[PDB]
């Protein structure tokens, strides 16, 4: 429902390789150009992973403050969770439970289900506080989970503007679990905030690096 | 007078003399991509073996 | 005769004019051999010739 035309954004670095002034082609798991994303907005239903998720919360948003990842979302299969407390990020690879709509003198700490059976933790800097557009790319291939963001100000708060956005690796995380279905986090402060979900599959891109060696333009195969 | 002018902006008659560097150059270049070929061995560089 | 994270090899090492990503280790050629590395225990970036 509510098929929104996701135009161009969603390209990312594979990995090692600095080059410059090159016209080079790669082959990984990719998000389609001109694809449709169901618009979301109060309302936050459940989503599956389906081998790759392009998360993009809207600008003029201060609501989404974390994520719950997993396969079953039970106390059996190892789960994953990140929380920004406005000065750090709190990565939990612990075991958790079910909460239908957790959220955040402004109140917090309602969100947590259970803190038993932890496997891994990580602490780093917070990501970032007409706004710098939050974008995230989620994938796990045999353990290595990765972080991607490129935050850019524009108008047109709901609909995605055109342009170009390479996705830059931030935290590579070798966990080694399964991910099939997940849920983001919200913050009910007494509420329809927008975000988008993408999908990856092995299509074929074509990359161009500039003289600085940064992606500026890219095309795919099955478009035309 | 016209013989520089037909060849001034871009004539369609440079052609054979331009690509004869170029198809040679990719023939050089397609020899270079074969270094990164693998042939069922588990590497391309010798040092990984 | 270098050895960076197990990749042996031979060449002359020099400081990089390149700008390296910050998430990275190996710059690789059309020939599919290493051209630019980052030190396994330093943050400096070295061009391999
Ligand atoms: C995306 O949605 C629009 C409008 O619903 C539709 O016209 C278009 O065919 C959809 N894209 C694909 C690939 O089906
Ligand atoms: C945590 O989960 C793992 C699953 O591999 C299990 O082996 C272990 O016994 C669990 N520990 C506790 C304290 O429940
Ligand atoms: C994923 O596949 C199944 C459950 O989906 C399980 O056997 C396997 O351990 C999982 N992979 C991991 C976490 O190594
Ligand atoms: C590379 O980035 C620098 C920093 O802004 C800029 O001055 C330079 O023009 C860029 N290179 C090109 C080819 O635009
Ligand atoms: C290894 O040496 C490097 C120096 O660059 C340092 O980063 C690391 O902490 C050292 N490890 C030790 C002393 O085991």
Curated annotation (Swiss-Prot), chain B:
Mutagenesis / variant outcome for changing residue 23 to H: In strain: Omicron/BA.1, Omicron/BA.2, Omicron/BA.2.12.1, Omicron/BA.2.75, Omicron/BA.4, Omicron/BA.5, Omicron/BQ.1.1, Omicron/XBB.1.5, Omicron/EG.5.1
Region (Heptad repeat 1): 1-39
Coiled coil: 18-49
Role noted for this protein: Subunit of the fusion protein that is processed upon entry into the host cell. Mediates fusion of the virion and cellular membranes by functioning as a class I viral fusion protein. Contains a viral fusion peptide that is unmasked after S2 cleavage. This cleavage can occur at the cell membrane by host TMPRSS2 or during endocytosis by host CSTL. In either case, this triggers an extensive and irreversible conformational change that leads to fusion of the viral envelope with the cellular cytoplasmic membrane, releasing viral genomic RNA into the host cell cytoplasm.
Protein name, entry field: Spike protein S2'
Species of the source: Severe acute respiratory syndrome coronavirus 2 (2019-nCoV)
Gene (UniProt): S
Residues shown, of full length: 932 to 980 of 1273
């Amino acid at each position: 429902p509510a098929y929104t035309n996701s135009f161009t954004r969603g390209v990312y670095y594979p990995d090692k390789v600095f080059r410059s002034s090159v016209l080079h082609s790669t082959q990984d798991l990719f998000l389609p150009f001109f694809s449709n994303v169901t618009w979301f907005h109060f309302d936050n239903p459940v989503l599956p992973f389906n081998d790759g998720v392009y998360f993009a919360s809207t600008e003029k948003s201060n609501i989404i403050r974390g994520w719950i990842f997993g396969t079953t979302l039970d106390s059996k299969t190892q789960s994953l969770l990140i929380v920004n407390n406005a000065t750090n990020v709190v990565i939990k690879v612990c075991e958790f439970q079910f909460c239908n709509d957790p959220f955040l003198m402004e109140s917090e700490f309602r969100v947590y289900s259970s803190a038993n059976n932890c496997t891994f933790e990580y602490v780093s800097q917070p990501f970032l506080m007409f706004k710098n557009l939050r974008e995230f790319v989620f994938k796990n291939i045999d353990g290595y989970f990765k972080i991607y963001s490129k935050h850019t100000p524009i108008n047109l708060v709901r609909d995605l503007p055109q342009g170009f956005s390479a996705l830059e690796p931030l935290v590579d995380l070798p966990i080694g679990i399964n991910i099939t279905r997940f849920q983001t986090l919200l913050a009910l402060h007494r509420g329809a905030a927008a975000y988008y979900v993408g999908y990856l599959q092995p299509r074929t891109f074509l990359l161009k690096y500039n003289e600085n060696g940064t992606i500026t333009d890219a095309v795919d195969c099955a478009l035309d | 007078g016209k013989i520089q002018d037909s060849l001034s902006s871009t004539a369609s008659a440079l052609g054979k003399l331009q690509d004869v560097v170029n198809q040679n150059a990719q023939a050089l270049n397609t020899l270079v991509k074969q270094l990164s070929s693998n042939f069922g061995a588990i590497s391309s560089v010798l040092n990984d073996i | 005769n270098f050895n960076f994270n197990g990749l042996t090899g031979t060449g002359v090492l020099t400081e990089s004019n390149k700008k390296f990503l910050p998430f990275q280790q190996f710059g690789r050629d059309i020939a599919d051999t290493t051209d630019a590395v980052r030190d396994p225990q330093t943050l400096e970036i070295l061009d391999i010739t």
